[PDB]
Write a protein that binds this ligand. Structure first.
Ligand SMILES: Nc1ncnc2c1ncn2[C@@H]1O[C@H](COP(=O)(O)OP(=O)(O)OP(=O)(O)O)[C@@H](O)[C@H]1O
Ligand SMILES: Nc1ncnc2c1ncn2[C@@H]1O[C@H](COP(=O)(O)OP(=O)(O)OP(=O)(O)O)[C@@H](O)[C@H]1O
Ligand SMILES: Nc1ncnc2c1ncn2[C@@H]1O[C@H](COP(=O)(O)OP(=O)(O)OP(=O)(O)O)[C@@H](O)[C@H]1O
Ligand SMILES: [Mg+2]
Ligand SMILES: [Mg+2]
Ligand SMILES: [Mg+2]
Lengths: 606, 362, 97, 54, 433
DNA sequence: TATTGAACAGCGACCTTGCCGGTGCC
DNA sequence: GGCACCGGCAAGGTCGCTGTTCAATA
């Protein structure tokens, strides 16, 4: 038994407190049928484009009423950096090497180049069996070729050279009889060009003697056309080296000594046709965070080559020190699928030329291209004698001076006969190049580029022509990451002629008219191409491979009387100067949006 | 018809702009200056600091002085964006697990002071996840004043699992002043502290292996970067470059008890439901200004791989825009057609008071 | 003495009986459905927003044609630059040492 | 264009009181709560003035 | 009126437990803050939160809860609950302006609902309100038993709750939202006991299995199943305290529990003649220690769990002074005794509404085995098992119930008012059950 | 006069919801 | 009989793909 009146008198009373039955949140569903989105729909909304509209409008107002001397044009490379102002006739060229104090020299940390087993079963093991047999067969092929070409060959020739070389012995002169006086870098002297650290770049780095009271090491941040991760302990150290080298080039070659003034300048950076996106996004970061330049713009090496020429349509063969690359340019783009990138160049011809003469008892058997004076000697000898011109070949005698540091100068006579042509001819059978270690370290520090939103998908460029050349070396459901990792494990190598035709077939995409235009439009650039009769020899090699095109094939070196090294640079300068280029990433864009703005701004699908 | 406004306000730099745009129009220091014996905001307050006392109204990610905070929003609309808020809806960003009372006060202010017609409050970590292009992941968000780790699954954050490392970009600046004083320089006043903040942003980086670096720093020439002060004097800094960022990984180095960002990440994943963890290891997202040092992605990949089982696949997502990801995600969210069904209208505010933010900004 | 009368027992008991049988029951349904809805809204929204964030990177016909136009614009401008510098005979080099 | 589209999709945009009157103003006030034993105690609660209509 | 908004009453809901303590506001599907009950102690100051427990010279790990799941350290309890309810869930006071490097009572609006274990004694209940009403200025207070809130978190007014926590396994009958006192049954055979079983089983494999906790390994390399480990260890300029290593090993035991251990779910007990022999033939489970050491587990994964169902199966306690579990402490004996505490007419209703709770109930196969055992011991009745929760995330059951309770409009008449307390002092034994 | 930048017209692929329905609990 | 889960289906617009036509350049 219960009652309310008793409870009232006891002071007990159940009460709602004026509250709702529940204060749990009640949630309404979102409706999404036929949804729409305003995100980045208009040019007004995209920062990279907003800023360009404002810039265009300001220039039109300035017309109602930019200076090339404030534009720096940079083109990096495995041996050489070209740098200069867009105002200028020509870039200054400097070796892209940085020299610093260290415990051990280059020579002290690694085995000698070219590679030899100094203990082993005779010349055949010392140089390697396959290599010696390759050399023999190529020598036979040349003799057959000269005889077929109705030119004289002496029945024995090597024996005239080899027995001279191995018996000559050097001569010493420099204390008394007048040489060219070399001048080793005075590493103790303080820098005058506006900085404290005693680092060296360019020719002044190469001419540091092997022994000096502070011991100095040389570092190359680019080799074979990519970041030189093999030689570096850590990523941070490599970025700091590329930054130090470019910083010293601005101060020492351009004379831009006050660091505060650089914010007034703008930059054009040339990149290869098959770029690593990690390398592009490094160079942008140096130019905007470390140098604080106002604007940065990019152009591909083959695109720039045509701008140097004044060509609308061409096939551009770019023979470097260590990279060679081919692509077809038409209607203002490199044709994305045409791109081919081979890992050899004029340096391999130097190594191979030395190695062929060494086997033929070249007097200076102690030579090792990791020693500085040896490297300079080998490059000089290469440029003096290497020759694809078949007709001028003979037994010839010459001499060279080994101006080693702090030792009297040694003079060697020597002879050659066919090393001078067989080493260059390696472009048409690259198996003789010492490709054994090119791939070492190729993902040691810096990973493959992945798409920013989907990190198992590679975002580095790819081309049908390059995959056709990988398949040519190694015949080729897994993920894209695993497939890319398999391709990465094959070094891209192919004959030069085959690489061109493979590039052009993918360029044309099964169209004989497009082929018949491009094949009459071969343009050769890059320092490695400067070997005599390179362009005629490349034409002949394509003609004897494709009779269906043989009457139309035409190969031209350079463009408009430029030097083959600078055509790419000149092109990049024209791209700086011309009015229509909106390809500039401004400093304010990159501070805001980092590498995302490259995708908004370039003149190709990045 | 006009777009909504997106405001991302923090311990260091406030950011503001229009919904739909891919970057803010305004980025300015969250400083309020008052005359000690009129008020001033941002670079203007720093320029005339001699006649002023300066404060930050946001401390450790959380608003702590509202009278000063309202001067920042006033400056944002009328001096930075040049727009009248009564024409536009507004999106405000909010720190992970900031107090309920703060949501009510920022709601109160944008309606009663600025008359905005409709508005929404949004969790910073979730926006930074949208801007990285995914629905599920764990966000390490690290600003000037605080660092958070936030697991999010199918767009819902998991409050119980959020772990707040209370050390961030200012601490790493203070620490870099301290170790530069040990090298023989001096940087004690505010006019020097702003130099030392710039020195981080240009010169510091995260070591991949700290033992190898701090051993090899004895010999390395390359490490010793030089820098030019406003006075034209040149400093040089060496192992200070990586010792400053290393404090993210070893908070003992700057003298507090906490796990480094790799351990707080790991712990936060491991507080989640067992089935979800495989997805979070596959989606570790980095956000906020302090995550911008070179190398940080790699060291986080390594350090969490060392803690995780060998059978897990661990992935670090660090998109190039990540300093502004919290704002970018707000721009996206405020520019969808569906935003119109999300926001608090002024008509709901009139009906319900500031508590409406607990019903709608879920 | 407080809190021990038969009426106190009855009122306390009756409150908890109603609270458990009626209110807890309704609020559990509402709570579970509300959570389900909230989680769905957030799933949907995360899906749209994450698509938009990536949408700028997807190639299109229109974008590709505009890009081919920008490339062709610059390429003709470059040809015009060489017309002018040929018709005004640009010089470059001296190399004495 | 999509933002102009009539019907249900944009029911939010057309409802905005752009450049309109001041909203009513809220103050932390106090509410009286009563236990089942009759005792009264106070909780801070948001409050605003009424909205009359003649 | 029409002067008030959508605001009503923002309760705090607080749930201390031997392993974890949970706090947050009512009207939310999950607690905002959950921290280990194990606090750190260094240089005379206490430290809280899983982000703060880290190796330091003299670091000592302590717990404010005893294995009765009751408070035994009210001074530390005060500091831990101040850290949760004040420092992490209220607006911060700003720094003085001089310190920032530019210039050269707390709970008065949130009532508190607090969670107690169902055997928590009168003197401990009294001191919980005494601590609250002195320290934080809270407006009003309520204290309620985990079984009741677990039942509410499954939406049930009348239920049998099986609650396999850390320090204790509990069974209780809830009817019309109140505990039937005679039904309360409790047991050590729970999450902490199960870690003791696992440690014993590891110290008794053919090669002994050693656990090295996560903080002691710097780096590791993957190695084959059963191979020697391959890693390098941290070295410290100080002794690691035994207490700290014991807490940091518990995480590794929690991974083994959540991912390897399985209740035997098959027909009859695991030791019945065919079952053990069959279990050795099955595909196993793989596991890794922080060491990098990797192994495949087969018949053991059942036996470590089986002890709470059949006491005969249990490994020897690794601590020699620990009492081994008796038949009366096994889950079936608890259930049978718990229901024998209740009127016969009410048993079908309870058995139709079984609610399971606490993280040890998340063992693989636990619901299966519980369904089988209930079937075989109560034939002829419908058995149905519910989780406590609004979501798949079933860890916070007893907290969620508090968040629902504190959100119901009819509940606010119940809180013990600040005034109602200060007039009486001992009101909480009577004006609460 | 060939080529261009652009506005405009037309269509299908696509995601998402409401609808009608089978099967089911209560 | 009310309400619900799960399913196949008809249907709505936004968006990108395809295409015609125009004023303008040089
Ligand atoms: N007069 C010359 N005759 C023949 N070869 C030369 C001559 N001058 C330079 N070379 C060779 O040309 C090579 C290529 O130099 P170049 O500057 O084109 O290469 P790079 O662009 O620096 O490097 P990369 O291979 O990455 O393109 C030099 O390494 C050298 O071997
Ligand atoms: N490039 C960079 N490298 C290193 N640190 C950077 C860089 N850019 C900015 N920072 C640092 O980032 C911090 C600012 O980050 P952010 O803008 O995210 O702060 P915030 O969002 O206001 O902080 P919070 O979100 O914690 O309130 C500062 O310490 C700044 O020095
Ligand atoms: N996923 C899991 N599977 C099984 N057991 C788990 C899991 N996660 C944690 N545990 C264990 O369960 C217990 C978790 O604490 P739990 O919430 O269940 O108890 P509590 O409520 O904190 O303590 P008390 O026993 O006082 O109620 C610990 O013993 C822990 O090791
Ligand atoms: Mg080159
Ligand atoms: Mg921030
Ligand atoms: Mg418990």
């Amino acid at each position: 038994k219960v009652s309310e009146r008793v409870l009232a008198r006891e002071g007990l009373e159940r009460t709602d407190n004026g509250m709702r039955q529940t204060s749990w949140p009640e949630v309404q569903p979102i409706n999404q049928k036929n949804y729409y989105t305003d995100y980045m729909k208009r040019d007004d909304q995209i920062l990279s484009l907003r800023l360009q509209n404002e810039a265009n409008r300001e220039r039109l107002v300035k017309t109602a009423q930019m200076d090339p001397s404030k534009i720096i044009v940079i083109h990096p490379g495995s041996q050489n950096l070209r740098i200069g102002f867009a105002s200028d006739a020509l870039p200054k060229t400097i070796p892209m090497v940085l020299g610093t104090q260290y415990s051990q020299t280059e020579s002290e940390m690694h085995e000698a180049l070219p590679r030899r087993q100094f203990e082993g079963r005779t010349m055949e093991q010392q140089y390697g069996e396959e290599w010696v047999k390759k050399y023999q067969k190529m020598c036979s092929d040349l003799k057959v070729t000269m005889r077929a070409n109705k030119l004289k060959v002496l029945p024995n020739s090597k024996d005239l050279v080899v027995n001279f070389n191995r018996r000559t012995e050097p001569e010493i002169i420099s204390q008394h009889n007048d040489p060219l006086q070399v001048e080793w870098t005075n590493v103790n002297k303080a820098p005058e060009d506006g900085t404290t650290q005693k680092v060296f770049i360019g020719q002044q780095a190469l001419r540091i003697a092997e022994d000096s009271s502070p011991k100095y090491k040389l570092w190359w941040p680019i080799q074979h056309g990519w970041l030189n991760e093999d030689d570096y302990p850590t990523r941070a150290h490599l970025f700091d080296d590329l930054e130090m080298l470019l910083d010293r080039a601005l101060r020492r070659e351009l004379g831009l000594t006050k660091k505060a003034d650089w914010k007034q300048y703008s930059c054009v950076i040339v990149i290869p046709d098959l770029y690593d996106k990690r390398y592009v996004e490094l160079l942008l970061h140096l130019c905007i965070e470390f140098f604080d330049l106002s604007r940065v713009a990019f152009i591909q090496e083959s695109m720039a080559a045509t701008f140097g020429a004044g060509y609308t349509q061409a096939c551009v063969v770019d023979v470097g020190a260590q990279k060679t690359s081919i692509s077809c340019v038409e209607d203002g783009l490199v044709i994305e699928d045409s791109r081919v990138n081979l890992k050899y160049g004029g340096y391999d011809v130097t190594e191979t030329f030395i190695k062929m003469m060494l086997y033929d008892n070249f007097p200076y058997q102690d030579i090792n291209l990791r020693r500085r004076h040896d490297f300079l000697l080998a490059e000089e000898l290469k440029m003096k004698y290497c020759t694809l011109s078949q007709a001028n070949i003979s037994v010839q005698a010459f001499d060279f001076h080994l101006r080693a540091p702090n030792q009297p100068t040694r003079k060697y006579q020597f002879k050659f006969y066919d090393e001078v042509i067989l080493a260059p001819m390696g472009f048409y059978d690259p198996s003789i190049f010492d490709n054994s270690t090119k791939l070492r370290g190729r993902r040691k520090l810096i990973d493959r580029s992945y798409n920013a939103y989907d990190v198992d998908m590679p975002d580095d460029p790819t081309s049908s022509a390059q995959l056709a050349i990988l398949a040519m070396v190694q015949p080729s459901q897994r993920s894209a990451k695993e497939i890319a990792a398999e391709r990465d494990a094959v070094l891209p190598i192919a004959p030069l002629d085959v690489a061109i035709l493979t590039s052009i077939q993918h360029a044309a995409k099964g169209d004989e008219k497009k082929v018949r235009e491009l094949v009459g439009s071969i343009m050769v650039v890059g320092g490695g191409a400067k070997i005599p009769h390179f362009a005629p020899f490349l034409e002949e090699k394509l003609k004897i491979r494709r009779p269906d095109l043989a009457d139309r094939i035409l190969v031209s070196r350079s463009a408009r009387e430029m030097d083959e090294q600078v055509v790419v640079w000149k092109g990049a300068s024209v791209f700086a100067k011309l009015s229509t280029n909106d390809s500039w990433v401004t400093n304010y864009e990159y501070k805001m949006l980092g590498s995302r703005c490259i995708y908004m701004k370039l003149l190709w699908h990045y | 018809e006009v777009a909504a406004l997106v405001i991302d306000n923090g311990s260091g730099m406030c950011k503001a702009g229009f919904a739909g745009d891919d970057a803010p129009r305004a980025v300015f220091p969250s400083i309020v200056g008052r005359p000690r014996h009129d008020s001033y905001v941002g670079d203007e307050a720093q320029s005339k600091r001699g006649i002023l006392t300066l404060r930050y109204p946001i401390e450790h990610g959380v608003v702590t002085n509202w009278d000063d905070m309202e001067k920042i929003w006033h400056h944002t609309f009328y001096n930075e964006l040049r727009v009248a808020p009564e024409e536009h809806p507004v999106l405000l960003t909010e720190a992970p697990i900031n107090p309920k009372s703060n949501r009510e006060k920022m709601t109160q202010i944008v309606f009663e002071t600025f008359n905005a017609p409709a508005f929404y409050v949004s969790i910073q970590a979730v926006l930074s996840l949208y801007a990285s292009g995914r629905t599920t992941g764990i966000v390490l968000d690290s600003g000037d004043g605080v660092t958070h780790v936030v697991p999010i699954y199918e767009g819902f954050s998991l409050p119980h699992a959020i772990a707040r490392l209370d050390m961030a970009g200012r601490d790493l600046t203070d620490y870099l002043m301290k170790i530069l004083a040990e090298r023989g320089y001096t940087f004690s006043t505010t006019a020097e502290r702003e130099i030392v903040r710039d020195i981080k942003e240009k010169l510091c980086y995260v070591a991949l292996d700290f033992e190898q670096e701090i051993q090899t720093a004895a010999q390395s020439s390359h490490l010793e970067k030089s820098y030019e002060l406003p006075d034209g004097q040149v400093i040089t800094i060496g192992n200070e470059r990586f010792r400053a960022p290393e404090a993210l990984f070893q908070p003992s180095v700057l003298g507090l008890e906490s796990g480094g960002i790799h351990v707080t990440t790991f712990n936060s994943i491991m507080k989640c439901d067992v089935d979800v963890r495989k997805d979070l290891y596959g989606n570790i997202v980095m956000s906020g200004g302090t995550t911008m040092y070179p190398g940080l992605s790699d060291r986080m990949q390594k350090e969490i791989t060392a803690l995780a089982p060998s059978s897990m696949k661990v992935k670090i997502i660090a998109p190039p825009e990540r300093k502004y990801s919290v704002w970018i995600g707000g721009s996206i969210l405020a520019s969808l057609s569906t935003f119109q069904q999300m926001w608090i209208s002024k008509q709901e505010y009139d009906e319900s008071g500031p508590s409406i933010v607990h019903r709608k900004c879920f | 003495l407080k809190f021990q009368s038969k009426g106190y027992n009855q009122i306390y008991d009756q409150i908890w009986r109603d609270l458990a049988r009626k209110d807890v029951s309704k609020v559990f349904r509402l709570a579970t459905d509300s959570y389900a809805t909230k989680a769905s809204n957030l799933k949907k929204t995360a899906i749209l927003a994450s698509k938009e964030a990536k949408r700028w990177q997807l190639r299109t016909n229109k974008g590709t044609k505009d890009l081919q136009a920008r490339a062709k614009r610059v390429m003709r401008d470059m040809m015009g630059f060489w017309k002018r510098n040929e018709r005004e005979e640009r010089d470059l080099r001296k190399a004495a040492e | 264009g999509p933002k102009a589209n009539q019907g249900a999709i944009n029911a939010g945009l057309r409802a905005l009181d752009r450049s309109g009157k001041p909203c009513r103003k809220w103050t932390r006030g106090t509410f009286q709560m009563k236990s089942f034993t009759g005792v009264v105690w106070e909780i801070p609660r948001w409050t605003a003035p009424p909205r009359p209509k003649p | 009126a029409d002067i008030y908004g959508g605001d009503e009453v923002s309760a705090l809901v607080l749930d201390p437990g031997y392993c974890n303590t949970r706090a947050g506001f009512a009207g939310e599907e999950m607690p905002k803050q959950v921290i280990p009950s194990f606090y750190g102690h260094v240089d005379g100051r206490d430290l809280f939160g899983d982000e703060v427990i880290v190796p330091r010279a003299g670091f000592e790990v302590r717990n404010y809860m005893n294995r009765d799941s009751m408070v035994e350290d009210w001074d530390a309890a005060t500091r831990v609950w101040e850290y949760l309810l004040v420092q992490r869930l209220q607006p911060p006071r700003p720094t003085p302006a001089s310190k920032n490097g530019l210039n050269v009572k707390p709970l008065t609006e949130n009532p508190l609902l607090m969670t107690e274990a169902p055997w928590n004694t009168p003197k401990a209940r009294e001191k919980a309100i005494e601590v609250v009403m002195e320290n934080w200025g809270t407006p009003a207070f309520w204290l309620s038993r985990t079984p009741v809130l677990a039942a509410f978190a499954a939406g049930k007014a009348t239920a049998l709750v099986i609650d396999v926590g850390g320090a204790n396994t509990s069974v209780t009958a809830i009817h019309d939202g109140m505990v039937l006192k005679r039904s309360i049954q409790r047991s050590p055979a729970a999450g902490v006991w199960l870690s003791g079983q696992i440690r014993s089983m590891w110290k008794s494999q053919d090669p002994p299995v050693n656990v090295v906790p996560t903080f002691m390994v710097e780096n590791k390399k993957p190695v084959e199943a059963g191979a020697p480990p391959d890693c390098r260890l941290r070295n410290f300029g100080f002794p690691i305290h035994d207490s700290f290593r014991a807490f940091e090993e518990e995480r590794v035991l929690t991974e083994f529990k959540e991912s390897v251990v399985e209740v035997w779910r098959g027909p009859g007990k695991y030791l019945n003649p065919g079952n053990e022999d069959f279990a050795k033939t099955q595909p196993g489970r793989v596991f890794e220690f922080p060491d990098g050491s990797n192994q495949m587990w087969r018949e053991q994964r059942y036996r470590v769990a089986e002890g709470m169902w059949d006491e005969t199966a249990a490994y020897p306690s690794l601590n020699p002074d620990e009492a081994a579990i008796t038949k009366a402490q096994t889950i079936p004996a608890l259930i049978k005794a718990a229901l024998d505490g209740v009127d016969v007419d009410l048993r079908p209703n309870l058995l139709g509404n079984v609610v399971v709770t606490g993280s040890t109930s998340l063992l693989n196969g636990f619901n299966d085995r519980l369904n089988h055992e209930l079937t075989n011991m109560y034939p002829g009745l419908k058995i149905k098992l519910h989780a406590a929760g609004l979501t798949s995330e079933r860890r916070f059951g007893a907290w969620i119930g508090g968040s629902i309770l504190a959100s119901l409009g009819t509940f606010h008449q119940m809180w013990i008012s600040r005034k109602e307390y200060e007039e009486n002092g001992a009101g909480i034994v009577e004006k609460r059950c």
